[PDB]
Design an enzyme around this catalytic site. Structure first.
Site, PDB file in Angstrom:
ATOM      1  N   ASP B   9       0.877  -1.167   0.000  1.00 30.22           N
ATOM      2  CA  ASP B   9       0.000   0.000   0.000  1.00 30.22           C
ATOM      3  C   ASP B   9       0.913   1.215   0.000  1.00 30.22           C
ATOM      4  O   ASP B   9       1.554   1.514   1.031  1.00 30.22           O
ATOM      5  CB  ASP B   9      -0.923  -0.015   1.231  1.00 30.22           C
ATOM      6  CG  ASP B   9      -1.696   1.273   1.493  1.00 30.22           C
ATOM      7  OD1 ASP B   9      -1.730   2.172   0.541  1.00 30.22           O
ATOM      8  OD2 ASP B   9      -2.343   1.368   2.617  1.00 30.22           O
ATOM      9  N   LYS B  71       2.473  11.493  -3.621  1.00 31.30           N
ATOM     10  CA  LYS B  71       1.352  10.843  -4.285  1.00 31.30           C
ATOM     11  C   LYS B  71       0.346  11.831  -4.873  1.00 31.30           C
ATOM     12  O   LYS B  71      -0.377  11.505  -5.844  1.00 31.30           O
ATOM     13  CB  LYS B  71       0.629   9.958  -3.268  1.00 31.30           C
ATOM     14  CG  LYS B  71      -0.347   8.985  -3.891  1.00 31.30           C
ATOM     15  CD  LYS B  71      -0.757   7.908  -2.968  1.00 31.30           C
ATOM     16  CE  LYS B  71      -1.874   7.084  -3.540  1.00 31.30           C
ATOM     17  NZ  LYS B  71      -2.226   5.990  -2.612  1.00 31.30           N
ATOM     18  N   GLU B 176      -7.268   0.505  -4.513  1.00 31.45           N
ATOM     19  CA  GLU B 176      -7.327   0.425  -3.058  1.00 31.45           C
ATOM     20  C   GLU B 176      -8.646  -0.180  -2.555  1.00 31.45           C
ATOM     21  O   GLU B 176      -8.592  -1.015  -1.644  1.00 31.45           O
ATOM     22  CB  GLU B 176      -7.029   1.795  -2.452  1.00 31.45           C
ATOM     23  CG  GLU B 176      -5.564   2.158  -2.594  1.00 31.45           C
ATOM     24  CD  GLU B 176      -5.246   3.630  -2.460  1.00 31.45           C
ATOM     25  OE1 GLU B 176      -6.069   4.396  -1.871  1.00 31.45           O
ATOM     26  OE2 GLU B 176      -4.127   3.983  -2.878  1.00 31.45           O
ATOM     27  N   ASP B 199     -13.227   4.969   3.251  1.00 25.84           N
ATOM     28  CA  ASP B 199     -11.786   5.005   3.397  1.00 25.84           C
ATOM     29  C   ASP B 199     -11.331   6.405   3.787  1.00 25.84           C
ATOM     30  O   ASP B 199     -11.131   7.313   2.957  1.00 25.84           O
ATOM     31  CB  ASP B 199     -11.088   4.518   2.130  1.00 25.84           C
ATOM     32  CG  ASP B 199      -9.574   4.463   2.170  1.00 25.84           C
ATOM     33  OD1 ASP B 199      -8.935   5.090   3.066  1.00 25.84           O
ATOM     34  OD2 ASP B 199      -9.020   3.752   1.299  1.00 25.84           O
TER      35      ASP B 199
END
Ligand SMILES: [Cl-]
Ligand SMILES: [Mg+2]
Lengths: 41, 380
Positions: B9, B71, B176, B199
């Site tokens: 991850d 990211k 994800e 999430d």
């Protein structure tokens, strides 16, 4: 075409070729593999 | 031979690695004993490269030379409105090079260096690789890496490229929410179902509606807020205490990065503690001008400081259900991802939204995405 089929039908196509979709989490994965393998079968 | 394929991850604020063995996944602790690793890079004054906990923990008067949130930039062009917004809140310099955002930092020695986002993410992947190698007692060459469902082709390719730079063949890029669903074994059950993945990460909030059909997923609808996460709750608490300290001492600590860093570390710990306790004591020796800091935060005050942010998580959920024309009752599984989902008020909002339905449980929500990645890597 492909994107309109049920997952069971996509698996049916691959099974009939004796091909497996290894580590294929999503429907797009099955669609992509059938497209790439189609000229073989 | 691909050896032992690990699951990674590669997260906005934290990253996580696991390996499948003996019918389960082992989430691998790093050399500081942590099962998650900050997605951070920094340099010592002497020019030593720090990655992970050491990078995040390094006290500095120069925050502009610590790199994080790469990211947010990876696989994006310089003119992307997302980049142009994000660079306004990032403390380090981001410059255009090759129509692309590059990160410019001091690396020690009165030398600066410019890095592509994917070179920073390669450094993070290197640390996760090392973490895995130390546990496995062998080299790792292949991985499954997760990305957000909304990532485009360039972003997915840039993630693979980060892997390549780190010496990893990224065999699969998986979304994800799908990874979290795999972690909970939802692909191994019969029948057609609707899965809602909620999430709430350190920096981003993602709601994903997945279907499962004969063991295979489809991401049907996504929503969320890329600027809502656990760090925003911490910032609300930071502001409260900075304001309180100034009221109490007449000292404004905001210009003083080292004091701010010390407070942020203790606030992060307090927040985690308030998921299981009703009070948390924040104590910092030599906080500011050699004077000590000692204050308490109640769960009620924590809730009060963040109530609008907590409630705001329910709107994307409504949007996803509306977009798919699903009733609340059509949701067969609710999967929670991120340690912020352990916040009692967030649990209560989710439970109330879904008419008392219990979410999936059994996997640490900070680890669930890596877990799923490691499951998928286990068949390769
Ligand atoms: Cl994160
Ligand atoms: Mg995440």
């Amino acid at each position: 075409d492909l994107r309109k089929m049920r997952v069971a039908e996509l698996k049916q196509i691959l099974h009939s070729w004796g091909e497996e979709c290894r580590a294929c989490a999503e429907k797009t994965d099955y669609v992509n593999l059938i497209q790439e393998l189609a000229p073989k079968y | 031979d691909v050896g032992t394929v690990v699951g990674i991850d590669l997260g906005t604020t934290y990253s996580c690695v696991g390996v499948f063995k003996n019918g389960r996944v082992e989430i691998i602790a790093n050399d500081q004993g942590n099962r998650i690793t900050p997605s951070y890079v920094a340099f010592t004054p002497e020019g030593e490269r720090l990655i992970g906990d050491a990078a995040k923990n390094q006290l500095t008067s120069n925050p502009e030379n610590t790199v994080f949130d790469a990211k947010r930039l990876i696989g994006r062009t310089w003119n992307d409105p997302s980049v142009q917004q994000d660079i306004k809140f990032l403390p380090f310099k981001v410059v255009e090079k090759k129509t692309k955002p590059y990160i410019q930092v001091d690396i020690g020695g009165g030398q600066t260096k410019t890095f592509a986002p994917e070179e920073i993410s390669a450094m993070v992947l290197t640390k996760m690789k090392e973490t895995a190698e130390a546990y496995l007692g062998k080299k790792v060459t292949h991985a499954v890496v997760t990305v957000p469902a909304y990532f485009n082709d360039a972003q997915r390719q840039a993630t693979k490229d980060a892997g390549t730079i780190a010496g990893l063949n990224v065999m699969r890029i998986i979304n994800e929410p799908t990874a979290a669903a795999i972690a909970y074994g939802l692909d191994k059950r019969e029948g057609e179902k609707n899965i809602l993945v909620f999430d709430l990460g350190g920096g981003t909030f993602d709601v994903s509606l997945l279907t499962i059909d004969n063991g295979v997923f489809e991401v049907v609808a996504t929503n969320g807020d890329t600027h809502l996460g656990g760090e925003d709750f911490d910032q609300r608490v930071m502001e409260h205490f900075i304001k309180l300290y100034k009221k109490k001492t007449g000292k404004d600590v905001r210009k003083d990065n080292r004091a701010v860093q010390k407070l942020r570390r203790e606030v992060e710990k307090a927040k985690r503690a308030l998921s299981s306790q009703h009070q948390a004591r924040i104590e910092i020796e030599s906080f500011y001008e050699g004077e000590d800091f000692s204050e308490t935060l109640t769960r009620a005050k924590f809730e009060e400081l963040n109530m609008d942010l907590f409630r705001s998580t329910m709107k994307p959920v409504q949007k996803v259900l509306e977009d798919s024309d699903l009733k609340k009752s059509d949701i067969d599984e609710i999967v929670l991802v991120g340690g912020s989902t352990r916040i009692p008020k967030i649990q209560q909002l989710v439970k109330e939204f879904f008419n008392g339905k219990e979410p999936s449980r059994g996997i640490n929500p900070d680890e669930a995405v890596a877990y799923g990645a490691a499951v998928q890597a286990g068949v390769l």
